[PDB]
Design a protein around this ligand. Structure first.
Ligand code: O1A
Length: 171
């Protein structure tokens, strides 16, 4: 069976219980924690690409009030659906399964200014999603996996001083 497991789930869960925040910038910012997954049940002989995108979690935006995240108004129009291609793609099942797959280089931005960055709306909640795409497949079979431990709000600056502190402690 295809299994895609979240690495450092217990680290993600520390951020998630505070409500996780990821910085977006003009030029794009790497994530902490980094999304890493373990994979089993691929065909080791087959070739696959690994894709990452971010799904909008809510029909509303959020704001940080009196140290709580609350519904913060109507959403902006959905950010363009940007997909990140893992730089190891395309590769053998064996490659993907022999070690955790790390999305260390993906950059989150609030400006479409090129370089394979992901555009997100500040104060909107997102859930990372990985797609496995089989190479050379006439059916173009794709599998998708969501990671609810990895949910965060996109921010131009940290709202929760506890998140700021956690990001320094564990990085
Ligand atoms: C430093 C590194 O590369 N990885 C790393 C991974 C995991 C953790 N912990 C911390 C919090 N939690 C109790 C468990 C997960 C911390 C660091």
């Amino acid at each position: 069976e295809l299994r895609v497991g979240l690495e450092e789930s217990e680290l993600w869960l520390r951020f998630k219980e505070l409500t996780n925040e990821m910085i977006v910038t003009k030029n794009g910012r790497r994530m902490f924690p980094v999304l890493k997954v373990n994979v089993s049940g691929l065909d080791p002989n087959a070739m696959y690409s690994f894709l990452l995108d971010f799904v909008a979690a809510d029909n509303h935006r959020w704001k940080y009030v009196n140290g709580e995240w609350v519904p913060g108004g109507k959403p902006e129009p959905q950010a363009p659906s940007c997909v990140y291609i893992h730089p190891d793609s395309p590769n053998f099942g064996a490659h993907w399964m022999k070690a955790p797959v790390s999305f260390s280089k993906v950059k989150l931005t609030n400006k479409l200014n090129g370089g394979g960055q992901i555009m997100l709306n500040s104060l909107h909640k997102y859930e990372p999603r990985i797609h496995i795409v089989r190479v050379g497949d006439p059916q173009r079979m794709i599998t998708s996996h969501c990671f609810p431990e990895t949910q965060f709000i996109a921010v131009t600056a940290y709202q929760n001083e506890e998140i700021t502190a956690l990001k320094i402690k564990y990085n």
